[PDB]
Each structure stands twice: as C-alpha cells, then as structure tokens.
Design an enzyme around this catalytic site. Structure first.
Site, PDB file in Angstrom:
ATOM      1  N   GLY A 166       0.850  -1.174   0.000  1.00 58.93           N
ATOM      2  CA  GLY A 166       0.000   0.000   0.000  1.00 58.93           C
ATOM      3  C   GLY A 166       0.889   1.227   0.000  1.00 58.93           C
ATOM      4  O   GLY A 166       2.115   1.110   0.067  1.00 58.93           O
ATOM      5  N   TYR A 175       1.178   3.115   2.297  1.00 61.48           N
ATOM      6  CA  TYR A 175       1.690   3.193   3.661  1.00 61.48           C
ATOM      7  C   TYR A 175       2.077   1.825   4.203  1.00 61.48           C
ATOM      8  O   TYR A 175       3.025   1.700   4.979  1.00 61.48           O
ATOM      9  CB  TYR A 175       0.652   3.833   4.589  1.00 61.48           C
ATOM     10  CG  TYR A 175       0.769   5.337   4.703  1.00 61.48           C
ATOM     11  CD1 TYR A 175       1.783   5.917   5.456  1.00 61.48           C
ATOM     12  CD2 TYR A 175      -0.139   6.176   4.065  1.00 61.48           C
ATOM     13  CE1 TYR A 175       1.895   7.288   5.564  1.00 61.48           C
ATOM     14  CE2 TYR A 175      -0.037   7.550   4.171  1.00 61.48           C
ATOM     15  CZ  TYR A 175       0.983   8.099   4.921  1.00 61.48           C
ATOM     16  OH  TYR A 175       1.093   9.468   5.031  1.00 61.48           O
ATOM     17  N   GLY A 176       1.344   0.800   3.787  1.00 63.19           N
ATOM     18  CA  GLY A 176       1.526  -0.517   4.362  1.00 63.19           C
ATOM     19  C   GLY A 176       2.174  -1.572   3.484  1.00 63.19           C
ATOM     20  O   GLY A 176       2.098  -1.522   2.256  1.00 63.19           O
ATOM     21  N   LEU A 189      -8.270 -13.167   3.869  1.00 64.45           N
ATOM     22  CA  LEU A 189      -9.125 -13.591   2.760  1.00 64.45           C
ATOM     23  C   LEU A 189      -8.324 -13.983   1.515  1.00 64.45           C
ATOM     24  O   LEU A 189      -7.245 -13.456   1.268  1.00 64.45           O
ATOM     25  CB  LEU A 189     -10.166 -12.533   2.425  1.00 64.45           C
ATOM     26  CG  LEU A 189     -11.400 -12.523   3.328  1.00 64.45           C
ATOM     27  CD1 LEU A 189     -11.262 -11.462   4.413  1.00 64.45           C
ATOM     28  CD2 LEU A 189     -12.637 -12.272   2.485  1.00 64.45           C
ATOM     29  N   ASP A 231     -13.346   4.617  -1.599  1.00 69.54           N
ATOM     30  CA  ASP A 231     -12.372   3.978  -2.471  1.00 69.54           C
ATOM     31  C   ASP A 231     -12.814   2.572  -2.853  1.00 69.54           C
ATOM     32  O   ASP A 231     -12.007   1.647  -2.901  1.00 69.54           O
ATOM     33  CB  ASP A 231     -10.973   3.960  -1.829  1.00 69.54           C
ATOM     34  CG  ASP A 231      -9.849   3.661  -2.853  1.00 69.54           C
ATOM     35  OD1 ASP A 231     -10.040   3.890  -4.066  1.00 69.54           O
ATOM     36  OD2 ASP A 231      -8.768   3.191  -2.439  1.00 69.54           O
TER      37      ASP A 231
HETATM   38  C1  T7Z Z   1      -2.836  -2.832   0.605  1.00 67.11           C
HETATM   39  N1  T7Z Z   1      -3.565  -3.982   0.160  1.00 67.11           N
HETATM   40  C2  T7Z Z   1      -4.092  -4.933   1.145  1.00 67.11           C
HETATM   41  N2  T7Z Z   1      -4.083  -4.695   2.541  1.00 67.11           N
HETATM   42  C3  T7Z Z   1      -4.692  -5.859   3.292  1.00 67.11           C
HETATM   43  C4  T7Z Z   1      -4.807  -5.889   4.818  1.00 67.11           C
HETATM   44  C5  T7Z Z   1      -5.120  -6.883   2.356  1.00 67.11           C
HETATM   45  C6  T7Z Z   1      -5.767  -8.241   2.681  1.00 67.11           C
HETATM   46  N3  T7Z Z   1      -5.345  -9.326   1.980  1.00 67.11           N
HETATM   47  C7  T7Z Z   1      -5.873 -10.553   2.201  1.00 67.11           C
HETATM   48  N4  T7Z Z   1      -5.419 -11.699   1.455  1.00 67.11           N
HETATM   49  C8  T7Z Z   1      -5.010 -11.707   0.047  1.00 67.11           C
HETATM   50  C9  T7Z Z   1      -4.338 -12.852  -0.407  1.00 67.11           C
HETATM   51  C10 T7Z Z   1      -3.897 -12.955  -1.748  1.00 67.11           C
HETATM   52  C11 T7Z Z   1      -4.128 -11.912  -2.631  1.00 67.11           C
HETATM   53  C12 T7Z Z   1      -3.641 -12.074  -4.034  1.00 67.11           C
HETATM   54  C13 T7Z Z   1      -4.807 -10.747  -2.195  1.00 67.11           C
HETATM   55  S1  T7Z Z   1      -5.113  -9.381  -3.352  1.00 67.11           S
HETATM   56  O1  T7Z Z   1      -5.551  -9.902  -4.619  1.00 67.11           O
HETATM   57  O2  T7Z Z   1      -6.113  -8.480  -2.846  1.00 67.11           O
HETATM   58  N5  T7Z Z   1      -3.709  -8.544  -3.478  1.00 67.11           N
HETATM   59  C14 T7Z Z   1      -3.612  -8.021  -4.722  1.00 67.11           C
HETATM   60  C15 T7Z Z   1      -2.248  -7.458  -4.957  1.00 67.11           C
HETATM   61  O3  T7Z Z   1      -1.867  -6.557  -3.881  1.00 67.11           O
HETATM   62  C16 T7Z Z   1      -1.844  -7.334  -2.649  1.00 67.11           C
HETATM   63  C17 T7Z Z   1      -3.147  -8.004  -2.370  1.00 67.11           C
HETATM   64  C18 T7Z Z   1      -5.243 -10.645  -0.840  1.00 67.11           C
HETATM   65  N6  T7Z Z   1      -6.809 -10.746   3.133  1.00 67.11           N
HETATM   66  C19 T7Z Z   1      -7.269  -9.721   3.875  1.00 67.11           C
HETATM   67  C20 T7Z Z   1      -6.749  -8.412   3.661  1.00 67.11           C
HETATM   68  C21 T7Z Z   1      -7.277  -7.278   4.480  1.00 67.11           C
HETATM   69  N7  T7Z Z   1      -7.699  -6.418   5.128  1.00 67.11           N
HETATM   70  S2  T7Z Z   1      -4.774  -6.409   0.829  1.00 67.11           S
END
Ligand code: T7Z
Lengths: 257, 296
Positions: free
Chosen positions: B16, B18-19, B83, B127
């Site tokens: 992110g 920030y994260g 998730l 968002d």
């Molecule tokens: C800054 N983005 C995120 N912050 C948080 C806390 C996220 C999150 N992720 C998961 N599991 C998860 C596992 C695999 C994938 C591929 C994905 S994703 O498709 O959304 N992906 C796309 C590319 O950038 C990173 C994340 C998510 N579960 C819960 C949270 C929350 N809150 S994402």
C-alpha cells in the site's frame, strides 16, 4: 437523510461509551478544573490560528478528558497532553492537519517534537485508538435541521454556547453531548427568536424542556457570566463575522420554565 | 491481543502507499491473518488513524475484520482476518467462463449490506473498486482498505476533494461538488456491478474530463431537468458536448430487466435520487438471491 435516524441512534449509544469519568479531577493530585479551563481556552486559540474546524476542537477535548480519566498528569505536562490531543484530532478530522512542527511551535517550544510524538503514541494507547467520539457539535448540526426556517444567528449562538461548555469541567462533565447540544440549541433559539425546543426534536431525541432543564439552568448561568469568565478566547472568537458576532448578543434575563 | 512472537510469516501479499502486507499464521491457534505493517517522522499517519478507529467500530460479516493492533516502538502492525484474493483477481481468472449471474447477485447483495452498515455508522469508504473487495472460498465478499474512509456528519461538511479511484469516481466529485455524501459509494458499486457483468471497467477514463465525457456518452449529458443544480457546479462547463442517453439495455446487454432497473438507480446523476445501500437491499433484482460458493 436516509441514515439520519440510524446515525443519531448510533451516536446516542456511542456518547455513553465515550463519556469521560465525571469525577476524575478529584483523583488528579496536581491539576484542577481551573488549569483545565486554561488548557481548553488555549486550544480554542490554536484552533483559530490554524483555522481548524470546530469539530476538531471538540474531539480534542473529548480525548483530553478521557485520557485524564485514567492517567495522572503533572501540571507541567498537561499542555503536552493537550498538544498531542489536538494533533490527533486534527489528523482525524482535518483535510489539511497542521504539521507536527507547527504544534511544537505553538507550545512556545516548551516541549520537543520527540515528546509531542511520544505523547501522541501514549494517547493512542490509552484511548485504544477509539477516536471517532460523538461531540456536541455533531448533535447540534442534526438539531439545526429542525429549524423553521433556518437561522444563522441561532446556529452560531448554539455553537458558541456548546463551545463555552468545554471550558468548565464543573459542571459540564456530567452531561452527555447530546444533552448539552439540546440545552444550547434551545437557549440560542429562545435568545434570538423567542421560540422553544421544537416538538419534532422531542420525537427525535426523547428529550423535553423538562429533561433538559438541569443542563439548561447551568448553561444559562454560564451564558450570563461569560463576560466575567477568566477565560475569554471563545467570546473573542465569536465576535467574528464568521459567526455573525453572536457573542455580542445579549443573553435572556429569564428562561421561564 | 499479543505480539509478533506468535506470528509466522508465510509470504508477502502486496503493498500500500503506507503498508506492506504479509500472510501470516498464528502459531498457537493456527489462525491465518493478513498483517499490515506501517513504519513510523510526522508521527502516526492520518490514514492509519482513520482506518483503525473506524474499523474498530465496524463489526459486520461483509466488512473485513480488524483483529488487533500491535503498537510498538517503530512499528504499527494491523492484524486482519485473511481472505483468499480480491474481486479484481477473480474477474480476471473468470475470463472465459464468465461470472454466473447468481454469484454476481450474491456479491452485490453482500456488498450493499456491508455498505449500508458503513453509512448507518456515519462512515464513507471513498475507495470502492474490485481491488478492495476481498472474497473467500465460502461465498463471502467483504469491503476492505479503509485507508481513504472518513467519519461524516449530518448534514455533511466539505471533505477532501481528491477522492475515489478515477474509474469509480462519481460525477459530483468530478464536477467539484462542495458537498458529496454516501451516494459516492453507491456510484462506485454501480460501476462494480456493471464490471462484474462485462468483466471490463465501465468508465475507464485516463483523465478527469475523459472520465466525465465517458460517463456522459453512456448516461447522457446532464441538464437542469435530469439533475437540478448541475449547470451551476464549479467545474461544470457550458461547452460540454451534449450526448443523448443511450438505452440502458445496451449499457450492459446481458443484464435482465430487474438488474437494469437497479443499475440505473445506482447510476442516477442526482445524488439525492441515487438509491441508498439500505433501499437497494429490497430491490426485486434480489428476490431469488442465494449464496453460491465461487471456484478456487
Ligand atoms: C494494501 N492492500 C491490502 N491490505 C490488506 C490488509 C489486504 C488483505 N489481503 C488478504 N489476502 C489476500 C491474499 C492474496 C491476494 C492475491 C490478495 S489481493 O488480490 O487483494 N492482493 C492483490 C495485490 O496486492 C496485494 C493483495 C489478498 N486478506 C485480507 C486483507 C485485508 N484487510 S490487501
């Protein structure tokens, strides 16, 4: 307007959970209500200088009271607590929060940037990050929707009265924001137009002139004695045309309840 | 509420502004989490302060659950429920199969639920887009990323103008409305609804004016009839091309009559006429809604 009731209900529930400890000042060894009045007055000054929202100022006072409800503070550190609260409130509520350096500057360089940030951290801990507290201001803006028709002097007077309550922990620490909001709104409405707490706000809030009366009596005396109060930053603020110079209005001699 | 002692990192997930996000396993409970790391010279960032406080207030089946906040010296660790992927990834994988209508209906129903909840608790997300909607292997979908979110008041003040990812941004923000509200989140869901049906974004503009024009070519250029007050909006211009509204059935051809009805209400130009998340729940489109599980 599709959520106004849901939100009002929710805020009413949360104001109870976010309420400061009514008698925390007795448990404060070094500081007093008068010192607190001094800090809050100053926070109003800071709000003006940086053109912060009123909401920000209310939030910051909520944070200070809740913090001082569980933590003993020496008088030399009270301002540090206040500075960090305003900072957090600003970060939470403002589109453009003043930078930390700016907060360090307004404390007359009493504290270092490092202390300000460490206190920010400590405040967050003590409040466990629960910053989205209900405020008098939040209830006032909802109450304003019940005017017929809207009157700017009334809104500004109400805001002004609500704001005076922040200064004096005794007695306002014992009234919920929604109740101070009601007392303030009725007092402003009465002063400007001669009208009263509208039947529709009774349906909405469940509050009556009778339930408001105790807070209303205090707030009335506060209003009457304002020009004599040791703290004067809220009266200076509301001399401004931004708020229709409502601090210059004359308080009613009698409320007639 | 403990420390990173009991977490075992499994792999990085993404990032992110920030994260930095990792998938992790609680070693004592077996629980899988997503850890968001926030490094700390202006103190705790405002976005992190909003995200945490608002998220602690929002306990709902379709809002991602903040499990804990580990607040240390130089590190702030936010612990989220884990998730499996985001909606964006899923749509891509569902390339040739397409997304079954009952699963679209389900996801939309769930999203309206999480959203109505946010709005009921005076929170705007600001968002919504497929990248921020996460799905699991049991049929759930949940709003995520409350970094851009905001506690609002009744009636609203003026808030940050620069909000919502462009493709999903509402015309009242594009036109410089001093006072947007919950309607902007509905606009976004409307765009997501159409995207789930076609699997391509609905208004993929590359700039603000491109974004407006794309919207206008689809929904007609708005006038004082369709949208009272429009021509007196700050960034409105009299020189705007005036396009006819096209038949809505051409906007998303596979959609049935109920779906079209609902989409049109979510994309109403007038924020005031634009349907609320709460009201949308009762739309006939959802009469036969179920909860299918998606495919890995
Ligand atoms: C800054 N983005 C995120 N912050 C948080 C806390 C996220 C999150 N992720 C998961 N599991 C998860 C596992 C695999 C994938 C591929 C994905 S994703 O498709 O959304 N992906 C796309 C590319 O950038 C990173 C994340 C998510 N579960 C819960 C949270 C929350 N809150 S994402």
């Amino acid at each position: 307007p599709d959520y106004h009731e849901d939100i009002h209900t929710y805020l009413r529930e949360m104001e109870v959970k976010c309420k400061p400890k009514v008698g925390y000042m007795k448990k404060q060894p070094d500081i007093t209500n008068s010192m607190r009045a001094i800090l809050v007055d100053w926070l109003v000054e800071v709000g003006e200088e940086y053109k912060l929202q009123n909401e920000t100022l209310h939030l910051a006072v909520n944070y200070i009271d809740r913090f001082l409800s569980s933590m003993s503070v020496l008088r030399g550190k009270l301002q540090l607590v206040g500075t960090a609260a305003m900072l957090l409130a600003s970060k939470f509520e403002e589109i453009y929060p003043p930078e930390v350096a700016e907060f360090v500057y307004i404390t007359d360089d009493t504290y270092t940037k490092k202390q300000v940030l460490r206190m920010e951290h400590l405040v967050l801990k003590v409040l466990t990050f629960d910053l989205a507290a209900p405020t008098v201001n939040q209830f006032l803006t909802q109450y304003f929707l019940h005017q017929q028709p809207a009157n700017c002097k009334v809104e500004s007077l109400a805001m002004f009265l609500g704001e005076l309550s922040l200064i004096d922990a005794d007695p306002y620490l014992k009234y919920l924001p929604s109740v101070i909001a009601g007392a303030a709104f009725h007092l402003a409405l009465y002063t400007v137009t001669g009208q009263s707490w509208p039947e529709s706000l009774i349906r909405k809030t469940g509050y009556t002139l009778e339930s408001l009366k105790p807070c209303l009596m205090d707030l009335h005396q506060t209003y009457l004695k304002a020009p004599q109060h040791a703290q004067q930053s809220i009266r200076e603020k509301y001399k401004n045309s931004k708020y229709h110079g409502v601090s210059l209005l004359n308080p009613p001699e009698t409320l007639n309840l | 509420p403990g420390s990173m002692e009991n977490f075992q990192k499994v792999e990085k997930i993404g990032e992110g502004t920030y994260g930095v996000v990792y998938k992790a396993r609680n070693k004592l409970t077996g629980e899988v989490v997503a850890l968001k790391k926030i490094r700390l010279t202006e103190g705790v960032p405002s976005t992190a302060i909003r995200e945490i406080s608002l998220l602690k207030e929002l306990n709902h089946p379709n809002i991602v659950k903040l499990l804990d906040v580990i607040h240390t010296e130089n590190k702030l660790y936010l612990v989220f429920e884990f998730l499996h992927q985001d909606l964006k990834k899923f749509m891509d994988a569902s390339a040739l199969t397409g997304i079954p209508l009952p699963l679209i209906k389900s996801y939309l129903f769930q999203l309206l639920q999480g959203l109505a909840f946010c709005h009921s608790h005076r929170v705007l997300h600001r968002d919504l887009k497929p990248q921020n909607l996460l799905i699991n292997t049991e049929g759930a979908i949940k709003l995520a990323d409350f970094g851009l979110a905001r506690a609002f008041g009744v009636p609203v003040r003026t808030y940050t103008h620069e909000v919502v990812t462009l493709w999903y941004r509402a015309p009242e923000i594009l036109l410089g409305c001093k006072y947007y509200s919950t309607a902007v989140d509905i606009w976004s869901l409307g765009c997501i609804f159409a995207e789930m049906v076609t699997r391509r974004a609905l208004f993929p503009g590359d700039s603000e004016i491109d974004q407006l024009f794309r919207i206008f070519r689809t929904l007609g250029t708005p006038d004082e009839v369709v949208w009272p007050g429009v021509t007196s909006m700050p960034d409105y211009k009299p020189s705007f091309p005036k396009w006819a509204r096209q038949d809505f059935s051409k906007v998303v051809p596979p959609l049935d009559e109920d779906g079209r009805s609902l989409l049109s209400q979510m994309l109403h130009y007038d924020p005031n006429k634009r349907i609320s998340a709460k009201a949308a729940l009762a739309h006939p489109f959802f009469q036969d809604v179920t909860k299918p599980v998606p495919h890995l």
